[PDB]
Amino acid sequence: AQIGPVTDLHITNANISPDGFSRPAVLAGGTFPGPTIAGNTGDNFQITVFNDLTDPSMLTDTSIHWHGLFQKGTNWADGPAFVTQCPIITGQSFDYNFNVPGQAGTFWYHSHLSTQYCDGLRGPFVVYDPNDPNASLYDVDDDTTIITLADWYHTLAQQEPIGAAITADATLINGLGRSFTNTTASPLSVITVQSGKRYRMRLVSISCDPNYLFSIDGHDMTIIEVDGVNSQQLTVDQIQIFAAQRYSFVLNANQPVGNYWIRAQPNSGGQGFDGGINSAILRYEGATVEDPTTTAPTTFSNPLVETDLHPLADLGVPGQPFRGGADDPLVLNLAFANGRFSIDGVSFVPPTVPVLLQILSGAQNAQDLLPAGSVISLPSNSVIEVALPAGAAGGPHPFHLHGHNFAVVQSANNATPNYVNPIWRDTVSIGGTGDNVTIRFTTNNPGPWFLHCHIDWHLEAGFAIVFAEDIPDTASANPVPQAWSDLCPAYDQAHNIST
Template sequence: MKQFVVSAVLLAAFQSAGAAVTPAVVHRVTMNVVNAPLAPDGFTRNTRVPPILVNKGDSLVVTVNNRLTDPTMRRSTSLDLDGLFSTTPELFQEGSPFVTQCPIAPGASYTYTNGPIQQAGNFWYHSQLSVQYIDGFRGPLIVYDPEDPQAHLYDVDDINTIIQLGDWWHNTTLSPTMLPQYEATGIIPVSDSSTVNGVGRYNGGPAVPWAVITVVKGKRYRFRLINESARNIVTVNFEGHSMTVIEADGEALTPHTTNAIDMLAGQRYSVVVTANQPVSNYWINAPFVGGNPANNLNQNATLSRAILRYAGAPAVDPTGPMEITPFPNSLVEGDLRPLVAQAAPPADVNMTLDLEVVAGKAIWNVNNVSYVAPKTPTLVKVLNGASTEADFNVTENTFIFPPNKTIQFTFPPNDDDDAHPLHMHGQNFWLIKPNSTDVVNTVNPIKRDIAAAGANGIQLRFRTDKPGPFFFHCHIFWHYQAGLATVLLNDPAGTRAQVHPNAEWESLCPAYNALPAELQ
């Protein structure tokens, strides 16, 4: 019953938000990926992996040492710094297997470089290979802004205010067993439990102590919420407290007060919560949906929670009800506005993307094409001269765009049960029509990198100012593995002019391709 454990050594001092501005530093992280038994919900498998904490303006250098040896699990790996954008010259280190690189073979190492980082907010890291990150290779990546224009809204913002939300599975051979079962039946696996900061419970399981976050009455806390699940939509609510949303997916927002937030897989939010209630214990509720619970009798959405404990309160569970009811004043994504308004530029290219599933099968299509990862990564092909759609297999579903244009994607309403969290690598997009509203807003829409395509349809726009191939896929990784993905290739000639990989990158594909299938 082994799970991936990621041990990370950060070789740079961390500068917290609100402190005096200091010169940028280079953070060097050594990340050892190994197998070890863990048990977040009492069933031995998982862990809460270490966070990576850096400042805006810093550089991040991460060396991944692949030490995976368990033959029942996927042994090659990769690293995606999710939501953190590589510059085009660094694109070969972006971390998308078969798009920008080949996976890292067992026993090998690879170093990813990013920076100076120009973003700030909540991000996370995980394996991008297959559904491997469900096996434990995932953790928070926070970029603090020492000059945060919203720092006056909160008093505390540190490692203790990061809230990781994840799904947990008891199957001990998740990647090599459950994925083929899904592909054969079309029935997506249902998680046994959900975790809050690495802790959860399930029906009939042990009463594992809840994760506890301690607050001091009167102080304002910036909680950084990250949904690291591979499928589940999690609703976050602080019992007896409202939340003021100030950031989504690394983009600052005009403060917006709400009582609950539905978070899709991969999404991140920053919320300010004021400890203004009587000294006591309160639930941090995180109920979830993710498939039919009848397919896994261990699942109980009401057991996804943690405790908000005021300093001075007894170390006991809250007395509030365990039942979950619809929360009033839940967040409507279409009501959010950016802190600094920016109009979405007019579209130069309009495309409609239809998402369809083949009934009874694990096959998802985007415009009637089910994505299949090629053996030769997209970037390798581009560097070798590929420039037109004819240079790629149809199943690579590669859309080629000219430079310096605005592209509009329209996703029509679909009647599928899932709201697909569509995730764009490399840049954010303007969400001009969210799934939550029929209003098209091109004047001051929010920007983010994950949005739901569902029953009401969505529209988004993005620029092709940045050359390179960028993965665009559903962050329900079961769907992505079943073909719900595309590659957006901006300016192939510009990509060749700016991307010049190093020898370490050049060695990845020969090493991976030489592996027997069981080691890939």
Template structure:
């Protein structure tokens, strides 16, 4: 009896320990991304790609508000026709000063990951929620396929009563697709100044090109009477997509991770990097309907594969036949109510503080060359990343780094001047996808890392809004002028660049370095991060 009792007591004492050691920390979301070359045919044309876990788009990363992502990236790239090093940025995730070294911006906050090596990004999400994405931040590498959704769910979403369904089936990823690999296309761009024109557009990784096979379109399934939160992401490296769903209105409730007051429209034009959540009510007759995503991105005559109207997918009601819609595809954007950015209002308003520092950014391109300037400077990535320099105590940056040193805890106002009609080389605006214009030089969208900004003067409006402007992290610039404001409460070297990555590669970028003294004081990188630059710099050029 005593033996049995002692054994039971011993077991009772020991039992919690192995259970505790195996417990899962719910605050950590572990993700593994194997970056590989794989032959894929998103639009029916087989080519070698750079993708995460063998798929395009890459696997969706999902998390809950307050979690920390622990993303292990294993670089397994071998194809010499594309970059073989890599780095991953989590678009729209602010990061913090202490964690800025995990931000993933090549040569700003980190060196790339060498082929055959691995790195684990620690990404605390804090109070952020909403629709985001991840992609390669190295050169134009994500043109080859390294892009995917990143969704942060909020269990206490204040707009939860507006929709019934919000899961991975309602994520819609738009992308431009090239049938050639990025390095040869980049060489031609640098030789001619002509941005490569995509062969097709994809919706959830599937598209068609003119003269190509009839690849089955992607399908979003719905049930009559239910309301769906569609999370729409423009993952393009260039193209502007115009999103609509035949016969259905769309109620915008989020822009770039910021909840908005419900605003109902029919058509949404989306620049590269922009995201929206819209509520679609399945209240139409049971049938198949087109989800439309035509695009612009250069003259179609420069790529005879391009047919923007083939960029679409299907909304299928339960009970509808497994078939394409029988109604003819129409130019829905011409007949619906368009989204005007200036009409968006945040759900929780925060009046932008008065500006403490004013900066004007003038964007120009040298005709016939792949050279973009910001205030007459074409950005060139430094050999030693900006963050490394700051941590080493340097206050000196090459002019080509285009680094603005900003004071702590101030409001920065950046103005992009209006574009004159006779100054088309600077023009940047959201254009109708059916205009016969050349967007090689007249379209761009600026994206801020490390935070977002108030759009106090949208290019979609002639007036400023200092009362309740939308906050977002990607905005179009040009037209009647764009003015944004942001706070320097998150010290760090944050990339501020055009999200048309061909333009970024050509120099259309700056670095907003907020409070370098606080960066030096509060940023303490790991040994793994410190090892990235020596490993990358030791590589032969062809492996970088």
């Protein structure tokens, strides 16, 4: 069952074996992935997170981010450790109490401390629309139509070298899949459909790193939502989905009753499908209970290309129709060397006092804020442009901005900008060498918003900066509850930190 919008959520350690190999994990709600948190657009969510963690090998502190929700007026509830809060300590709990005005779509939640979400703390978060403009395009939209894609590691995250190219041991679809080495015929996930019905499949990348080539043998997929943003219908036969992105697509159960492979090929780790790796099963009601015999094509004739996507609403693009045509035009220097990433010459290392608390304590400008050189101020009520030129090792890097979505003015692998009708989203591949992926948004949400690569290993190695949006209005805009003001004293006391 789905939980929320008002719910407790316990964070525990347990052994799991999603690919047949047993390892300890960090779990929300006792499962991998965690339970779906759900509500309707505009609802008040109050998720009281109980930190019950005791295994130090995966960290006993935690903090949870609600990925893609803007948190307007509730920056304190956003979750990134040392940006908007100190972590929750073990044996304590914290109510993330926020509202979701003006958003409806497919999201997710995950740990936002260190690389802890890799160890298991990841699940879906869906905000339904009772008046959804796409409602007439399908029959079924519920917990059975969510499809998660996850990387899974046999080595615990805190034992992964920083700045290394770390590789997974299994792809998991809806929590199940097979190991790339020492493969055993462990259970595969089954997605069940009824011949003739149309399904809103909500495809969620909960990846810590790889991108997936996602397809379903015999079927095509009609995209109607991108990272929470309704799209015009776009029919494709393959979706390359980068870490943390989401799509809704219509699946028409219009093929002969039978079994069909669902495929998710990562860019690293095991290649192909031998032994049923990288696979799940689409089963029609009435089909025999047996594995599919279907084949992938050698090439996919209608792959998703990001420039083909357009918003359903007339969203346009803020600013002027040329490079630098914004109130605050930025170009970030994104680099990697010797195990560490940097942005504008500075590698991100989390500060001792969270950025929001520094601002609430009176810090007057981005040069007063720590980490030095890791915080850029943005002016209020202004069009921001951010060019993100690729090249840094370990690509393609999916960049994500907290507190906002954005127009994708220029996409990967295509030098032509679009100032008319590009898709809006919240996580974007910046492409390959020589690309100049560029985003735009307007600043109507005061607070410190993290901008970072969403390959979690890269974030840990410093590939991040903080946009301190409208510093002057941050305190008046984001009143903080006593439970939030209690978090840093408790955390620093527990860890013997002075501040």
